[PDB]
Enzyme design. Structure first.
Site, PDB file in Angstrom:
ATOM      1  N   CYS A   1       0.801  -1.230   0.000  1.00 18.56           N
ATOM      2  CA  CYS A   1       0.000   0.000   0.000  1.00 18.56           C
ATOM      3  C   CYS A   1       0.831   1.277   0.000  1.00 18.56           C
ATOM      4  CB  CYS A   1      -0.939   0.026   1.210  1.00 18.56           C
ATOM      5  SG  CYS A   1      -1.966   1.516   1.292  1.00 18.56           S
TER       6      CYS A   1
ATOM      7  N   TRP B   1      -9.391   6.053  -0.998  1.00 18.62           N
ATOM      8  CA  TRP B   1      -9.642   6.781  -2.234  1.00 18.62           C
ATOM      9  C   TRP B   1      -8.649   6.351  -3.313  1.00 18.62           C
ATOM     10  CZ3 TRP B   1      -8.665   9.652   2.352  1.00 18.62           C
ATOM     11  CH2 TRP B   1      -7.365  10.154   2.488  1.00 18.62           C
TER      12      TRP B   1
ATOM     13  N   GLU C   1      -4.607   3.899 -11.012  1.00 17.83           N
ATOM     14  CA  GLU C   1      -5.370   2.679 -10.806  1.00 17.83           C
ATOM     15  C   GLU C   1      -6.459   2.555 -11.862  1.00 17.83           C
ATOM     16  OE1 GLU C   1      -5.674   3.359  -6.089  1.00 17.83           O
ATOM     17  OE2 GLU C   1      -6.315   1.361  -6.708  1.00 17.83           O
TER      18      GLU C   1
ATOM     19  N   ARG D   1      -0.283   4.596   2.899  1.00 13.48           N
ATOM     20  CA  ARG D   1      -0.257   4.394   4.347  1.00 13.48           C
ATOM     21  C   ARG D   1      -0.006   5.616   5.227  1.00 13.48           C
ATOM     22  NH1 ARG D   1       3.845  -0.358   4.870  1.00 13.48           N
ATOM     23  NH2 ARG D   1       4.207   0.038   2.650  1.00 13.48           N
TER      24      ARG D   1
HETATM   25  C1  HEM Z   1      -6.125   6.598   2.017  1.00 19.22           C
HETATM   26  C2  HEM Z   1      -6.053   6.252   0.670  1.00 19.22           C
HETATM   27  C3  HEM Z   1      -5.399   5.126   0.127  1.00 19.22           C
HETATM   28  C4  HEM Z   1      -4.733   5.083  -1.091  1.00 19.22           C
HETATM   29  C5  HEM Z   1      -4.500   6.186  -2.117  1.00 19.22           C
HETATM   30  C6  HEM Z   1      -4.232   3.748  -1.248  1.00 19.22           C
HETATM   31  C7  HEM Z   1      -3.652   3.306  -2.416  1.00 19.22           C
HETATM   32  C8  HEM Z   1      -3.273   2.023  -2.727  1.00 19.22           C
HETATM   33  C9  HEM Z   1      -2.895   1.597  -4.057  1.00 19.22           C
HETATM   34  C10 HEM Z   1      -2.618   2.458  -5.286  1.00 19.22           C
HETATM   35  C11 HEM Z   1      -2.797   0.271  -3.996  1.00 19.22           C
HETATM   36  C12 HEM Z   1      -2.593  -0.609  -5.223  1.00 19.22           C
HETATM   37  C13 HEM Z   1      -3.875  -1.333  -5.584  1.00 19.22           C
HETATM   38  C14 HEM Z   1      -3.704  -2.254  -6.761  1.00 19.22           C
HETATM   39  O1  HEM Z   1      -2.678  -2.141  -7.460  1.00 19.22           O
HETATM   40  O2  HEM Z   1      -4.602  -3.088  -6.989  1.00 19.22           O
HETATM   41  C15 HEM Z   1      -3.003  -0.129  -2.613  1.00 19.22           C
HETATM   42  C16 HEM Z   1      -2.915  -1.412  -2.097  1.00 19.22           C
HETATM   43  C17 HEM Z   1      -3.341  -1.820  -0.831  1.00 19.22           C
HETATM   44  N1  HEM Z   1      -3.929  -0.968   0.116  1.00 19.22           N
HETATM   45 FE1  HEM Z   1      -4.000   0.998   0.088  1.00 19.22          FE
HETATM   46  N2  HEM Z   1      -4.544   2.948  -0.162  1.00 19.22           N
HETATM   47  C18 HEM Z   1      -5.301   3.759   0.680  1.00 19.22           C
HETATM   48  C19 HEM Z   1      -6.035   3.271   1.768  1.00 19.22           C
HETATM   49  C20 HEM Z   1      -6.092   1.954   2.217  1.00 19.22           C
HETATM   50  C21 HEM Z   1      -6.921   1.472   3.334  1.00 19.22           C
HETATM   51  C22 HEM Z   1      -8.037   2.258   4.031  1.00 19.22           C
HETATM   52  C23 HEM Z   1      -6.536   0.150   3.565  1.00 19.22           C
HETATM   53  C24 HEM Z   1      -6.893  -0.725   4.590  1.00 19.22           C
HETATM   54  C25 HEM Z   1      -7.426  -0.350   5.805  1.00 19.22           C
HETATM   55  C26 HEM Z   1      -5.578  -0.181   2.503  1.00 19.22           C
HETATM   56  C27 HEM Z   1      -4.988  -1.424   2.309  1.00 19.22           C
HETATM   57  C28 HEM Z   1      -4.253  -1.803   1.188  1.00 19.22           C
HETATM   58  C29 HEM Z   1      -3.826  -3.159   0.933  1.00 19.22           C
HETATM   59  C30 HEM Z   1      -4.082  -4.379   1.827  1.00 19.22           C
HETATM   60  C31 HEM Z   1      -3.255  -3.165  -0.305  1.00 19.22           C
HETATM   61  C32 HEM Z   1      -2.678  -4.424  -0.917  1.00 19.22           C
HETATM   62  C33 HEM Z   1      -3.622  -5.132  -1.870  1.00 19.22           C
HETATM   63  C34 HEM Z   1      -3.103  -6.498  -2.280  1.00 19.22           C
HETATM   64  O3  HEM Z   1      -2.118  -6.957  -1.666  1.00 19.22           O
HETATM   65  O4  HEM Z   1      -3.685  -7.107  -3.204  1.00 19.22           O
HETATM   66  N3  HEM Z   1      -5.332   0.919   1.676  1.00 19.22           N
HETATM   67  N4  HEM Z   1      -3.363   0.970  -1.861  1.00 19.22           N
HETATM   68  N1  LIG Z   2      -6.911   2.546  -3.659  1.00 16.69           N
HETATM   69  C1  LIG Z   2      -7.530   1.435  -3.381  1.00 16.69           C
HETATM   70  N2  LIG Z   2      -7.623   0.526  -4.400  1.00 16.69           N
HETATM   71  C2  LIG Z   2      -7.371  -0.838  -4.335  1.00 16.69           C
HETATM   72  C3  LIG Z   2      -6.597  -1.435  -3.264  1.00 16.69           C
HETATM   73  C4  LIG Z   2      -6.366  -2.830  -3.221  1.00 16.69           C
HETATM   74  C5  LIG Z   2      -6.890  -3.672  -4.235  1.00 16.69           C
HETATM   75  C6  LIG Z   2      -6.657  -5.158  -4.197  1.00 16.69           C
HETATM   76  C7  LIG Z   2      -5.789  -5.637  -5.364  1.00 16.69           C
HETATM   77  N3  LIG Z   2      -5.613  -7.061  -5.259  1.00 16.69           N
HETATM   78  C8  LIG Z   2      -4.812  -7.631  -6.322  1.00 16.69           C
HETATM   79  C9  LIG Z   2      -4.598  -9.122  -6.124  1.00 16.69           C
HETATM   80  C10 LIG Z   2      -3.290  -9.693  -6.238  1.00 16.69           C
HETATM   81  C11 LIG Z   2      -3.085 -11.088  -6.056  1.00 16.69           C
HETATM   82  C12 LIG Z   2      -4.191 -11.939  -5.755  1.00 16.69           C
HETATM   83  C13 LIG Z   2      -5.502 -11.390  -5.636  1.00 16.69           C
HETATM   84 CL1  LIG Z   2      -6.840 -12.419  -5.271  1.00 16.69          CL
HETATM   85  C14 LIG Z   2      -5.704  -9.990  -5.820  1.00 16.69           C
HETATM   86  C15 LIG Z   2      -7.653  -3.078  -5.284  1.00 16.69           C
HETATM   87  C16 LIG Z   2      -7.905  -1.682  -5.356  1.00 16.69           C
HETATM   88  C17 LIG Z   2      -8.148   1.254  -2.147  1.00 16.69           C
HETATM   89  C18 LIG Z   2      -8.988   0.240  -1.787  1.00 16.69           C
HETATM   90  C19 LIG Z   2      -9.357   0.367  -0.521  1.00 16.69           C
HETATM   91  C20 LIG Z   2      -8.767   1.443  -0.018  1.00 16.69           C
HETATM   92  S1  LIG Z   2      -7.915   2.139  -0.995  1.00 16.69           S
END
Ligand code: HEM
Ligand SMILES: N=C(Nc1ccc(CCNCc2cccc(Cl)c2)cc1)c1cccs1
Ligand code: HEM
Ligand SMILES: N=C(Nc1ccc(CCNCc2cccc(Cl)c2)cc1)c1cccs1
Ligand SMILES: C[C@H](O)[C@H](O)[C@H]1CNc2nc(N)[nH]c(=O)c2N1
Ligand SMILES: C[C@H](O)[C@H](O)[C@H]1CNc2nc(N)[nH]c(=O)c2N1
Ligand SMILES: [Zn+2]
Lengths: 420, 420
Positions: A119, A291, A296, A122
């Protein structure tokens, strides 16, 4: 260092010392002979579809968390601490599980995000709204909580981070799951003519819905229905109230013809298929939202070949020289599409951040985390934006990736297990 | 797999099986608890500035290589194989080192490149010209070989890959080093007015030259002199013949004002500060060259903040809205600069490849390598281009990184050791 790892920024030459990695116990997937840093699912904790953690496997994990929680408030060893350890311990013994207090749940949720190495946003981690939905028992109850989350989070365009936590997994009783990958997403339909209408990434889910009775509008941007599962019972279809689904029509600040492309996207990104783990407890239904970062939508959602894949159309309308890749017509159309997305959300006054601002604040966050926490787990492969990588500060930043808990893990798609 | 690692392409869903990693013995820097995939110098073999490998440390390495070399030609165990092992063994015993035959040197050089996990142009690996300079004894002799390499490699614009190998390291006698980071590069001068003329990345080297008598032209694009070191003797300055240094004036195919920016770059990229290791032998002076990928110049060389950093100027001339990063003025100027670079080299008919074509051929190479070699070590962090990452196929390709030998390693800057 013989224990203190150093990460340097090659653009500013700043060097940081990481001691926080010493607190990681989970595996990364790498070994001294091979690096799996670019593997999407190194299956190192992608949540076992198996049974569920046992009493013996649960107390150590429960204890690790409390010790961590109490050290947070500088009360490690206190009576409260030891009293709480005995409660949970005794409670696990009789019920084979335990209940986190409200304070421990909020701390755990914020830290699951704080520890999310993939993320980039953060810097916002400590500003998360936690909605406790652990008293929910049916799909209708889940629908209500979700609608309330969406309304709160949306806040008429001034987005606010939030997460709704449904009942933790138990054993037999059964668990809660939001079958959707994100609360708000568009359907996809494989045309008989080999074409694919809508979002190709959601074709298999769209079929599950349709078979459940969903009246697919067979359109390009159809918001899918929620498919909720409570207490291991079959999922139920629900239509999020349209008035609650904020969307933005995409237009360009210079190319009046951009409007005609008929592009639009929703303003609230909300992940609903991940699993939240706190103190050995697993919350299989914990939708969270924040947001969007412009790329994205503009780079991945719109330009991924296996997504809307709109580069040609845009390129054509721009009358670009698509006869050779050397003309960089794809890159050129890519920049305009992303200028349109930012301009649009900003015009409608819907919260959004561009990759330039987002990555700079992440650097600030990293510096903050090294100062106060002794480090920051970061996955470079994911943190660097899908476009203009080297012009953003994170590209030149070395990052150490390791697993800390509480955290968000992946879990099996509900239809690849749930029977009936 | 319980031994067969799988890498998948998330864009095409193709999955490959890697068995080649089982042949790696060198460390990556990662452990099961932490990933160092984004560390530039995980110092896992950045060539010890220490002494030199001993007889006991050299034979095992020499043997590993021969076994590998002979298995290549399907003659493992042959008399030739065993005879050669005994020669080298006996030869190491008396001379404390050994000499690779011509065939083993060519095989080793090609494979050092074949094994270069950070190189995206390896599809070309088997087409390398090897120039054996092991009979060279002075700096003048090195200058001659280098000029010949540059002329051959340049081939009037139709670039050809090549490498010149000077005498291997010994122990006392002393070694050869090309003090330049690349055969052809521009000087940099820290202005008294806080400004920096030329390439900031080469300011410390430019000073070494000037102190050695170099008559710096104090310009923006001054090709630096070669600073050669033979047999551990002080380095000597040489001016590569200008007629041998092919350069390209940068202009845009639409913006006639681009010319006026006064941008120009050289056509032959040639690394001269790395160390080639084959069979435990270390070749500290082994300049190698191929051709440029457009982004190396347009994105990194021109737009890196700590390099020429030309984004503003270009952005200004384009009359862009640089009042907010959300306008993506940096991204927009970045695409034009790279369109100019490709258009220019192509116009002058100087070999070059764009990131789109380069990354697609690398995918092809990977598929080839998995089919015939059982795998391909690749460093994702380096393979993905510094701009438009996700629109290139390598972004969606999982890659396994591990160290195979022969190979190219990094080594201490010669002036941070050499005395006098
Ligand atoms: C405040 C604004 C936030 C922004 C701009 C942001 C942005 C991002 C972006 C650009 C990604 C990439 C998503 C993708 O490539 O599919 C990401 C991943 C992630 N974000 Fe954030 N985030 C925010 C808030 C949050 C919140 C509220 C949580 C959880 C409480 C969170 C948890 C995560 C996690 C778990 C991933 C990893 C997803 C994965 O491993 O598949 N994010 N975030
Ligand atoms: N900016 C956001 N977008 C976002 C964040 C995380 C993901 C999850 C992406 N998961 C990709 C993935 C990778 C590998 C295996 C699986 Cl199942 C899925 C998607 C949009 C936010 C979503 C919630 C808060 S921010
Ligand atoms: C045929 C054309 C070639 C192309 C287009 C190509 C391209 C590239 C590119 C883009 C990089 C990144 C450079 C950087 O970011 O600084 C790279 C790295 C590298 N290339 Fe290639 N390459 C080619 C030929 C060669 C040859 C001839 C060799 C050696 C015989 C070689 C060895 C390497 C090595 C060792 C690296 C890693 C550098 C490091 O680790 O610092 N390449 N290549
Ligand atoms: N396309 C090329 N360009 C190129 C390749 C490698 C390098 C080396 C980059 N080294 C970066 C680095 C990283 C970490 C430590 C050190 Cl000392 C140096 C530079 C240009 C080619 C050079 C030779 C053949 S192709
Ligand atoms: C194969 C590779 O790991 C994969 O394509 C990754 C690269 N970086 C990413 N980064 C983000 N933010 N999101 C992604 O989905 C990916 N995909
Ligand atoms: C910190 C990070 O490892 C570093 O900036 C890397 C990223 N990827 C790269 N990729 C290439 N080709 N060349 C580089 O110099 C870098 N720098
Ligand atoms: Zn790793």
């Amino acid at each position: 260092g013989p224990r203190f790892l150093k990460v340097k920024n090659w653009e500013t030459d700043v060097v940081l010392t990481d001691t926080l990695h010493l607190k990681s116990t989970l595996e990364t997937g790498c070994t001294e002979h091979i690096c799996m840093g670019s593997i999407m699912l190194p299956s190192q904790h992608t949540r076992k579809p198996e049974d569920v953690r046992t009493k013996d496997q649960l107390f150590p994990l429960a204890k690790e968390f409390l010790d961590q929680y109490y050290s947070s408030i500088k009360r490690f060893g206190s009576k409260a601490h030891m009293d709480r350890l005995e409660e949970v311990n005794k409670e696990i013994e009789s019920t084979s599980t335990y209940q986190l207090k409200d304070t421990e749940l909020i701390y755990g949720a914020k830290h699951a995000w704080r520890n999310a190495s993939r993320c980039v946003g953060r810097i916002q981690w400590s500003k998360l709204q936690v909605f406790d939905a652990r008293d929910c028992t049916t799909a209708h109850g889940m629908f209500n909580y979700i609608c309330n989350h969406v309304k709160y989070a949306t806040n008429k365009g001034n987005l606010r981070s939030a997460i709704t936590i449904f009942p933790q997994r138990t054993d037999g009783k059964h668990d809660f799951r939001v079958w959707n990958s994100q609360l708000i997403r568009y359907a996809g339909y494989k045309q008989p003519d080999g074409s694919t209408l809508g979002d190709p990434a959601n074709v298999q889910f769209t079929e599950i819905c349709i078979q459940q009775g969903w009246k697919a509008p067979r359109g390009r941007f159809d918001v899918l229905p929620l498919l909720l599962q409570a207490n291991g019972n079959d999922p139920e279809l629900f239509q999020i109230p349209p008035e609650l689904v904020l969307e933005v029509p995409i237009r360009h600040p210079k190319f009046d013809w951009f409007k005609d492309l008929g592009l639009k996207w929703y303003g609230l990104p909300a992940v609903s298929n991940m699993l939240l783990e706190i103190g050995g407890l697993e919350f299989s239904a914990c939708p969270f939202s924040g947001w969007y970062m412009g790329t994205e939508i503009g780079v991945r959602d719109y330009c991924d070949n296996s997504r809307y894949n709109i580069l040609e159309e845009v390129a054509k309308k721009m009358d670009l020289d698509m006869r050779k890749t050397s003309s960089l017509w794809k890159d050129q159309a890519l920049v305009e599409i992303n200028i349109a997305v930012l301009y649009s959300f900003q015009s409608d006054k819907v919260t959004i951040v561009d990759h330039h601002s987002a990555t700079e604040s992440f650097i600030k966050h990293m510096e903050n985390e090294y100062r106060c926490r002794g480090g920051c787990p970061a996955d470079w492969v994911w943190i660097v934006p899908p476009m203009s990588g080297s012009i953003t500060p994170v590209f030149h930043q070395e990052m150490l990736n390791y697993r800390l808990t509480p955290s968000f893990e992946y879990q099996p798609d509900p239809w690849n297990t749930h029977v009936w």
